[PDB]
Amino acid sequence: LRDNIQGITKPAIRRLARRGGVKRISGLIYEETRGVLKVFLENVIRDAVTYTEHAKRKTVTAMDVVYALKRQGRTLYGFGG
Amino acid sequence: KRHRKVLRDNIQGITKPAIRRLARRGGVKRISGLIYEETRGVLKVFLENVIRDAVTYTEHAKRKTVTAMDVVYALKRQGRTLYGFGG
Amino acid sequence: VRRSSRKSKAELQSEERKRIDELIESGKEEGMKIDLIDGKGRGVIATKQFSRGDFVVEYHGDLIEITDAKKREALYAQDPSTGCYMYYFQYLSKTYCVDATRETNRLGRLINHSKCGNCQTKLHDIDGVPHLILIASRDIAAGEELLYDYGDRSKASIEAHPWLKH
Amino acid sequence: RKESYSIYVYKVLKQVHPDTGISSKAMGIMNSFVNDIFERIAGEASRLAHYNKRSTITSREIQTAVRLLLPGELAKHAVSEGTKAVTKYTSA
Amino acid sequence: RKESYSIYVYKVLKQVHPDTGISSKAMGIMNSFVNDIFERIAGEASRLAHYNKRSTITSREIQTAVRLLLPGELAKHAVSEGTKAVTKYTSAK
Amino acid sequence: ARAKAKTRSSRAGLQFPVGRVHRLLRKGNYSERVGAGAPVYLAAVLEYLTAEILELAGNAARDNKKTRIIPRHLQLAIRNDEELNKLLGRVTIAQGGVLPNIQAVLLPK
Amino acid sequence: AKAKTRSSRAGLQFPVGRVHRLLRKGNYSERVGAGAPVYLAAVLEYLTAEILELAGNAARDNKKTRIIPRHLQLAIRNDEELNKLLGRVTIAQGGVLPNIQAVLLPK
Amino acid sequence: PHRYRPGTVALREIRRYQKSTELLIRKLPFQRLVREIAQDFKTDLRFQSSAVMALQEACEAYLVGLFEDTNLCAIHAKRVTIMPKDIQLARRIRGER
Amino acid sequence: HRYRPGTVALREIRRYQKSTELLIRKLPFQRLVREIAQDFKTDLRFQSSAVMALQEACEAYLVGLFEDTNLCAIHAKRVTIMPKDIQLARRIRGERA
DNA sequence: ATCGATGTATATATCTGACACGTGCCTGGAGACTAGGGAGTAATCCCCTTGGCGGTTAAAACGCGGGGGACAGCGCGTACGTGCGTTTAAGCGGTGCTAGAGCTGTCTACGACCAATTGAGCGGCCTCGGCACCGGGATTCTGAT
DNA sequence: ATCAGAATCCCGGTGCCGAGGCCGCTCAATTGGTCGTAGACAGCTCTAGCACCGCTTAAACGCACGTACGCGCTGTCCCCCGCGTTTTAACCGCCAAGGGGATTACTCCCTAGTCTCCAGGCACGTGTCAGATATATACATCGAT
């Protein structure tokens, strides 16, 4: 799995920005947003894999992700918990 | 000797030079003129929240004095953990 | 059938505001009689069980600017039988004066000064005009007198009136 | 034996909007909301009991936790509801 | 009679900076810091134990709580120190 | 176990399970003991909050001329209510979307 | 028989017994393993050793011998890890990091 | 041969994507990225479908809120276009590293 | 004789970032605290340590808010902080909807 | 400122999956009863909070002049939007496979509990030295020339 | 530059009060022994996560052109800053009272624990209807000739 952050394509980030209310989007926004997303995902997945490892499991579960997010301060309603 | 009648606020005790000292500590180089009323509003909101929570903790302990632990607990409730008052 | 009656904070604040306006312009003045005090002169005993924040009276008078405020008080004081009726207040870069020497049908101007009374005065602007409201900032019994602070620290007047500190 | 609040949220719904249903995803979301508010109130009541060196969580602790966690009007009305329920419960 | 971490903070101080004091205010601040980090780690370990439906906090739960609460290098070295301490504590008996 | 049993909920006039709330306050390690009115109070508060959210959600679903409350309607209710949005301000609602809101400086002239 | 504190068995300067008592009386779980307080005390000692070492470095760089809230503040806000850890923490009598934005310096 | 002024299509997309609720990132590329990032921390991990959907919902909500604040920053700078300096200001004020 | 406007500002900045004492004055701040608490429970009492804690917290709050405000202003190509900057900082931090 | 695409709300058909409902049962909730210990309540002491007085002086308030900094206008060029033809890879549905979650049973090591004891930690005391402070030589910044 | 000239840093020495060492007491940590139960480990089932493969087609991509906007520059005008004088009220010390915080002692009543009874909630299977398309109607919108 190499260079998958490019799977967050330019039109995808533009759709996210449209949902956010953005009207125009500088062209350097896309790499910045890919970096921001990779950082946020690294943090949440590190916490989720830690919860999983502690449960001696091997499947990251919806509850492991929900707990990671609740610990980041970003409680997520709709996947259990 | 007839005298006039005026008021005060106790929020104007956060004086303009004090707000400018705070801004200087924050690194502000130049200050607008409405920053003072804006900052007084901000500070009154923050104080209202923290003191409401501290007075709630006090009432629950059936005390009539607001100890420093009540303020520390209120601040931790807001998410602004304060070190150095017996926390 | 189960319906919440919550009245979001905007509704509560607006309703308190409208209540203030209609009460000020209602002239009800519930239960306040003029009597005598042992040394001060007149007295207005309120006969209702007040509590925190409830209304008491409106210090009805004439509102003016500051250029005439810093003058009219002394110009009425040139009459040594004027008492104390004018109220200044600083609000939005301007200080004002509540001309209340000319007698009115209201109960505002009829109160004396102290720092050990029961009232601390606020301000309300019913469409611009700042009406000097008086609220019960504490628990008052039916049979206590209206007594608030004039805020005035005129060292000359406090020299002549040592009773201003009390 | 999976624990949920689905049937009780159904009851409260059919009590508020008697001619309105609720999808399964919204059911899961209301379930999570109830779990989260329960966890908050219980953790805050625990903190209060520990602060005041008590051992029991009581209606006093739960009321103070409600007053700390919910903003103004929500807290006033929730305290009203809980006090009414406790008085009715101890009467019956 | 009220408990604190004053003498232990002072011992660790005399370990790291032998000729150096610490004022009363900084002593109170280190007290608050020790209490805060203790409460964080213990609450996270409690929450982990409740997650896995288990009743006992162990060195496993504490290690996971440390690896959750401290940022990368602090967490790595704190896990190192804790494991060292637990092995030395079980060797002797 | 005579004197035919009625649930603590029914005795309290609630729809949320007071017995389950008691069990959760016990097997949750919040405190050693747990008062008798604590589960009743907590269940009353939880049922109140649930009713308060579901009322606004049903109103939104009826505005959009629908019959089934959905995550979108929950999101709309919560974000539009001033105090539920403060209680649930750092909460993500799956498949909720955002509020329709365009800043004024982007509209045409 | 002769006794020696658990702290001495583990080589720690923090009280393993006090930590165990706190874990028990703090209502964290129905049971507390043997090595749980040892691990927790070791971690608390490591963290306070880090904080104290950096604060002592600050006190040296200030040519003083006592640590003070200001020195704790400097140590924390300068170390990136400790600043991420204690990021939502105010330190009484601690002041702020000396930092003037470049756009305000004289050109 | 009709054509709109630049901006009206953007406003229509705004109204559309604020009416809708569906996920705006492609599920399979997102899942692939998540599997990579996780592979960094622990090898041979499995993922529940609901776990990856939760990650996606959380990431999308994060980016949508970040873009709301970025748009506020841009409007503050008297612009209409959001820029990397706007994202960086939003994150720095908001507390992220 | 005279200093160019700005040099005394920077001198004050260096001075107040060197120091640690409280910048608001204790007696006015304490009067403010008492009047605010007067609206939640009458006849309250405050440990002097409690008022000092409140003052440390409030000054830390305002200092951090002014750092964020300065960042907003600098972002807007300005140097003078403004109420719109304070409002943007608060809104991005999540204190005012 | 109609034209005329161009897209958009209103209506009906309908149908597909999801939701609301009926059933049996088992497992958790309720009722009674007993024991004990946690907490309510009364008393007491002394700490520490509040209030007032007096003087100092440091700090706030006020006024003024002026300059630099915000803001509005303007021009330019560039980079972002919009649209269209093309490519590519997401998505959907099939199957199959097997890893690993989840539940069960056994049993042992481990942690709670309880009592005897002893030394580590705490509170009060006292001393000295570290930091503050006050005044002085130097040098290092700004600012008019 | 050219310079002075106020701030500012390095320097002594005094001084004072807080911090660090000392010691006696007491209470909580250690030790030893018992027990009961939690979880560790093995075993087995069987869901569901992964992999693959083919088709469809929706979405991504690349290109071209135009134009809206970002950004630099200029001018003005005004509103903060710096400074000097006055005033005011923070602050510090002192005293003096008294509320109420903290501790202790006692008693009672409320909650845990146990056992038994049983009904309500859960999985499970089924009927049906809400809402999501699909197409048509009428209309709204806006961009330009």
Numbering used by the authors:
A (entry chain B): 22 to 102
B (entry chain F): 16 to 102
C (entry chain K): 187 to 352
D (entry chain H): 33 to 124
E (entry chain D): 33 to 125
F (entry chain G): 10 to 118
G (entry chain C): 12 to 118
H (entry chain A): 38 to 134
Paper text:
SET8 (also named PR-SET7, SETD8, or KMT5A) is a histone methyltransferase that is solely responsible for H4K20 monomethylation in cells. Intriguingly, SET8 primarily promotes H4K20 monomethylation in the nucleosome, although it also possesses the ability to methylate the nucleosome-free H4K20 residue. In the complexes with H3 and CENP-A nucleosomes, SET8 specifically binds the nucleosomal acidic patch via an arginine anchor, composed of the Arg188 and Arg192 residues. Mutational analyses revealed that the interaction between the SET8 arginine anchor and the nucleosomal acidic patch plays an essential role in the H4K20 monomethylation activity.
